[PDB]
């Protein structure tokens, strides 16, 4: 009994469900861009079957690849949104841990609050990590470094009014590798009545976290076998 799920079944080369996902048509605009955030260096997003498609073997493929002078990739945001008191999990394979790449699985909200379940940074500086943000600019957060490899893994979070918890490859009764108490973040928005969040799966190229892709190996793929919330 899932409140939201996508098993990404369907024929090779087809698009993910338009009923479940919004596919980004552009990379967000960066207000005061660092070098790799500059228009013309930042990677782009588009709804193109070369960059986001089902492999016909039960996986969503998000692919970053150079087209002309621009790196293109993809971002999906769930149309559905879910509130407190659920468990959220995706099975993911990062075939894209290369210079310039910046994959992420996260729960978003356009007002405040963000649960970055896992991000890996290709810029050669930032360690991969799980992060909880509160506050409008996300300027109040707790973060936890965790290593990412290219194997299949399940990334899980639970959150409610009292806190947020994270697991890697969850097994029965395992302790979260990271948890955050509401009381540890003064502006904790997750306890607001009716507060909900959408799911995001994306593979960015360049920008701050991605950095220089010139030495990286492209095409680079992020595979998603499923996303489930219950
Ligand atoms: O975190 C980034 C790692 N990345 C940066 C290289 O300069 C190398 C990946 O193989
Ligand atoms: Ca699947």
Verbal overview:
The chain has 1 helix and 16 strands. It has a single domain (1-230), classed as Jelly Rolls (Sandwich). Strand 10 (129-134) and strand 11 (140-145) form a beta hairpin. Helices cover 2% and strands 44% of the residues. It has a 16-stranded mixed sheet that branches. With 230 residues, it is mainly beta. Bound molecules: 2,2',2''-nitrilotriethanol (211) and calcium ion. 2,2',2''-nitrilotriethanol is lined by residues 97-99, 121-124. Calcium ion binds at residues 7-8, 58, 225-226. It is classed as hydrolase. Keywords: structural genomics, PSI-Biology, hydrolase. The assembly is monomeric.
Topology:
Layout: E1 4-6, E2 21-23, E3 44-45, E4 52-54, E5 60-67, E6 70-78, E7 86-95, E8 101-108, E9 114-119, E10 129-134, E11 140-145, E12 152-160, E13 163-168, E14 178-181, E15 198-205, H1 207-210, E16 220-229
Parallel strand pairs: 3-6
Antiparallel strand pairs: 1-16, 2-6, 4-5, 5-6, 5-16, 6-15, 7-12, 7-16, 8-9, 8-15, 9-10, 10-11, 12-13, 13-14
The site of 2,2',2''-nitrilotriethanol has 7 residues, from loops.
């Amino acid at each position: 009994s899932y409140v939201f799920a996508d098993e990404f079944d369907g024929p090779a080369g087809s698009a993910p469900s338009a009923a479940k996902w919004t596919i980004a048509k552009a990379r967000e605009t960066i207000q005061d861009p660092t070098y790799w955030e500059q228009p013309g260096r930042i990677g782009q997003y588009r709804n193109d079957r070369r960059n986001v498609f089902l492999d016909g073997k039960s996986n969503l493929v998000i692919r970053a690849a150079k087209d002309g002078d621009t790196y293109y990739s993809a971002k999906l945001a769930s149309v559905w949104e879910g509130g407190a008191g659920h468990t959220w999990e995706a099975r993911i394979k990062f075939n894209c841990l290369t210079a310039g790449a910046w994959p992420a699985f996260w729960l978003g909200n356009t007002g405040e609050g963000e649960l970055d379940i896992i991000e890996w940074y290709g810029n050669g500086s930032w360690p991969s990590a799980t992060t909880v943000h509160a506050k409008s600019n996300g300027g109040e957060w707790k973060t936890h470094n965790i290593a990412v490899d290219n194997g299949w893994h399940r990334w899980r979070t639970q959150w409610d009014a009292e806190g947020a918890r994270f697991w890697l490859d969850y097994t029965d009764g395992a302790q979260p590798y990271f948890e955050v108490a509401a009381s540890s973040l003064p502006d904790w928005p997750f306890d607001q009545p009716g507060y909900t969040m959408f799911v995001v799966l994306n593979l960015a190229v360049a920008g701050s976290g991605g950095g220089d892709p010139s030495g990286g190996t492209y095409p680079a793929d992020m595979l998603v076998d499923w996303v489930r919330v219950w």
